[PDB]
From a paper:
The ryanodine receptor 2, RyR2, is a large tetrameric Ca2+ release channel located in the cardiomyocyte sarcoplasmic reticulum that governs the Ca2+ release involved in the excitation–contraction coupling (ECC). Its gating properties are modulated by numerous accessory proteins, such as the 12.6-kDa FK506-binding protein (FKBP12.6). The I784F variant is located in the cytosolic portion of RyR2 within the SPRY1 domain, which contains part of the binding site for FKBP12.6, a regulator of the channel opening probability.
We solved the crystal structure of the RyR2 SPRY1 domain with the variant I784F at 1.45 Å resolution. There are two molecules in the asymmetric unit. We chose chain B for the structural analysis because the mutation site in chain A is closed to a crystal contact. The overall structure of I784F is similar to that of the wild type, consisting of two antiparallel β-sheets, a lid region, a β-hairpin finger and three 310 helices. In addition, the two flexible loops with no visible electron density in the WT, including in the FKBP-interacting loop, have clear density in the mutant structure. While the root mean-squared deviation (RMSD) between the WT and I784F structures is only 0.34 Å over 177 Cα atoms, I784F clearly changes the conformation of the loop where the mutation is located. The mutation site faces a hydrophobic pocket formed by loop 663, loop 764 and loop 784. To fit the bulky side chain of Phe784, the main chain of loop 784 shifts away from the pocket by ~ 2.0 Å. Surprisingly, the variant reduces the melting temperature of the domain by 7° (~ 41 °C vs ~ 48 °C for WT), suggesting a strong destabilizing effect exerted by the variant.
Residue numbers in the entry:
A (entry chain B): 652 to 840
B (entry chain A): 651 to 840
The structure:
Amino acid sequence: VSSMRPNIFLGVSEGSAQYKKWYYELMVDHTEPFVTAEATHLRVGWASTEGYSPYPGGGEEWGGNGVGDDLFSYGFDGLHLWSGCIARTVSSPNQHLLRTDDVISCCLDLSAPSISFRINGQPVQGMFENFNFDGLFFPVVSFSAGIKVRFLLGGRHGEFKFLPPPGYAACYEAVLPKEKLKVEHSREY
Amino acid sequence: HVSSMRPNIFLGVSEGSAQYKKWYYELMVDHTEPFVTAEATHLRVGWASTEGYSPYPGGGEEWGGNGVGDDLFSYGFDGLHLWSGCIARTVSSPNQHLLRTDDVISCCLDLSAPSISFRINGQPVQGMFENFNFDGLFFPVVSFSAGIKVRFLLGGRHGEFKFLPPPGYAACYEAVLPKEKLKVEHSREY
């Protein structure tokens, strides 16, 4: 499984009076038809830097693993929410596994805290809430071979298809000052 | 304009056993564009240190994905020049040229010297990096403009070298953390 993420890192510093509600969308451009359902993986959501792999000297690195396959990430696959390698079904209109032209809205509310999703503008009935966190969250997607997706982070270069829920800010605005917005892709060698 | 790639191989000094202090990999250039006037190209390969990561709140540190040699924590070669701190140092080699299709660049990191040196199509590049501080962990890295296609040859089954590493050098592939899978990360402007 491959993974992609932008360089957008969201957290709370107590007393900083930060913006705490963040929104982005993912558009699915292509999935592979001629592959089996067990060989297909497409999940989108959020992950925490607390899930990084440790290195000598206190270093920590993103592992690029499947969204929801650990205790520090939270994914949606169209039918299910994933966390801790466990899937749970959630309802949405016309619910289906993620496919070409789906637009997934991803919501992170660090004041709750909560994570929720929309599919093609419509609420997904089921959320993650009151999870403990100790790190920074980033948008993330994981996918099997040949799948093509794009982050829509807001603004001229990734316009949202849907209006964010009240109180939510566009993820592109959270880039660190002086850094350029970039997308990182991880794949097995 | 410029993208960057790296494997998850991190090389550094420790107080433990250190049979291998000299590390080697190759980069194969699969495609560069022939000469065109409407665009300038960029292709640099070498090494970077985690000390060049960008700091984030809470002590986080992230790879910036910037051009190799565009800061004081990375060390790049482009066929004609070595780059560090955004400055180019002219070096020489036989049959000299900016990197092009089918070039194989050897990259060498010697943590005992310390030094970073290069070969091009098997021949030594005359001019190396030597009088640098080498704090942090080093990783192979490449930076390139759009449409350029390159591959790391790190050693191991999936990336055999075209040339023998110089005496005393070990393949980067051997330094993967034992619980990690070998992956390549690609950074691109959004």
